Homo-oligomer: A and B are copies of this chain.
Amino acid sequence: XMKXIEDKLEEIXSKXYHXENELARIKXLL
């Protein structure tokens, strides 16, 4: 439930690495 919630938050803190890095891809092409 809470350890569910805290371990989404730690999927979101992945998507927010893969956010930063595939922005930093485009920022490459430009």
A contact set with B: CB distance below 8 Å: 1-2, 4-6, 8-13, 15-16, 18-20, 22-27, 29-30
Contact = CB atoms under 8 A, between A and B. Distances in A.
Contacts of A25: 23-24, 26-27
A4 to B, nearest CB: 5
Count of chain copies: 4
A8 B9 contact: yes
Contacts of A27: 22, 25-26, 29
Contacts of A18: 19-20
B9 A5 contact: yes
A6 B9 CA distance: 10
Contacts of A1: 2, 6
